[PDB]
Amino acid sequence: REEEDVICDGCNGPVVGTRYKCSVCPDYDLCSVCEGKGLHRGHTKLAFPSP
Ligand SMILES: [Zn+2]
Ligand SMILES: [Zn+2]
């Protein structure tokens, strides 16, 4: 089967739990580790579940 997964654009790891999606850049997401490290603070991000 084909599945749609979310990959972190900061570290290339899986994004599980909460994803931090850029509201400006196309198709851009951070994992909680990279979000906590302060990546991509120059744009507003949307925080919502990444099941
Ligand atoms: Zn990451
Ligand atoms: Zn952005």
Residue 23, φ and ψ in degrees, nearest 5: -85, -5
What spacing in Å lies between the alpha carbon of 3 and ligand 1's midpoint?
A: 20
Are 35 and 20 in contact, with CB atoms under 8 Å apart?
yes
Q: Determine the Cα–Cα distance for residues 8 and 24; give it in Å rounded to an integer.
A: 16
- Taking alpha carbons only, the member of 33, 2, 25 closest to residue 50 is 33
Q: How was this structure determined?
A: X-ray
What spacing in Å lies between the alpha carbon of 18 and ligand 2's midpoint?
A: 17
CB atoms inside a 10 Å sphere around CB 38:
8
- Listed resolution, Å: 1.4
At 24, the amino acid letter reads: V
Are 18 and 48 in contact, with CB atoms under 8 Å apart?
yes
At 26, the amino acid letter reads: P
CB atoms inside a 10 Å sphere around CB 14:
12
What spacing in Å lies between the alpha carbon of 46 and ligand 2's midpoint?
A: 11
